[PDB]
Design a protein around this ligand. Sequence first.
Ligand code: NA
Ligand code: NA
Ligand code: NA
Ligand code: NA
Length: 444
Amino acid sequence: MKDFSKDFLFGVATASYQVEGAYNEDGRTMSIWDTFSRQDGKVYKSHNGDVACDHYHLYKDDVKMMKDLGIEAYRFSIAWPRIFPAKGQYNPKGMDFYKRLTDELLKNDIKPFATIYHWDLPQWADDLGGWLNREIVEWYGEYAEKLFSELGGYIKNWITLNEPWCSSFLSYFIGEHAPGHKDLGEALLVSHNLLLSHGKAVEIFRGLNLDDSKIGITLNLNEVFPASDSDDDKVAAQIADGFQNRWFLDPLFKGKYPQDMVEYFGKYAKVDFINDEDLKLISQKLDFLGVNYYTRAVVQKGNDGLLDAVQIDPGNERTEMGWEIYPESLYNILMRLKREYTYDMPLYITENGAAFNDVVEDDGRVHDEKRVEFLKQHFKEAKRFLNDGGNLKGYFVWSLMDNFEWAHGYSKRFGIVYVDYETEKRILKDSALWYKDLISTRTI
Ligand code: NA
Ligand code: NA
Ligand code: NA
Ligand code: NA
């Protein structure tokens, strides 16, 4: 008796700038993250993705390695600067990489899940205003249309955006991510144009009416807990919950922004970008929702720079990201989606994983037993979601390999495969051998 059906998709995930390297090869021009990584201090130790895992050149080895683990699906992102290295200038050599990547995946019985935008905005777009310029909806739409036309016969599962909360608030309000602005109003406008650009891609995708092809979006979601039962900490929790989750779930699945947060933000910045026609485009019916889950947040009243809510450390074990290990929130979020937002729509966990201080032993092994226990605990919550009626179609572990972890550089290792960057050698961690066995047995 299987806990994961034979139809269930055990997968792994990467992103273009985090793994590909070859940053100026075959016509690729800079993205906002190439630029950001060269701004003094914006990436830890001045790391960048010039070479990364060199997946652009080693992809056939990497696909073979995934075949040998039993991987059934592979979530990757397509680099906009490879496809349109300048405004209105298509680059066939960039497309060619994703066609030969896709061909290798299909020959190895691996189902491709393609993320259209995973933060590597072309620099030419940002120089015109980027996500602050409403015309990006058209530039993104033409970019998406080109991918559907050239790849839609071979890629059948499409994700418009990865984690728009990061591309908006983390990039334009907190400023940790490219382009690194620090203005709440800009972040709110960016979040709207991201969602509107998502709606343009869905509209284009529906018009093409490709056989057996599905489209969705990926959101990073948490569960917010008040530090105490006080009314003040409950209000702080509502703010944090709207900031992370409801600000994107409500427009996508209810067709409106959460009104409490519209009022809250409106005390501090402009919210005049809201209108009915935009929200109708944003709330188009999707085929699935991809969920990125890593941790919960415990919040108390206060204001330390961001909004009127301060996250605290509750004192439990954390990963090397400083993120609390809290698997139960994976079930709570998935059930919350089923009850309040997505109903019986298919759901995918498009990222879950952990960063630990991995070391290669004298015999060539990586005994990452903390990551094994992390993945076991979270797959058990996915199993419990399926047992309680949830429509979970797949689970993509982040990540296939250690890679460039954005503002942390290479200092944080998420992979089930260890990468020695000096030699680009791949080393299977014990978590990879455990995942191979889980795929074979499908019971946990
Ligand atoms: Na790269
Ligand atoms: Na750099
Ligand atoms: Na991706
Ligand atoms: Na939908």
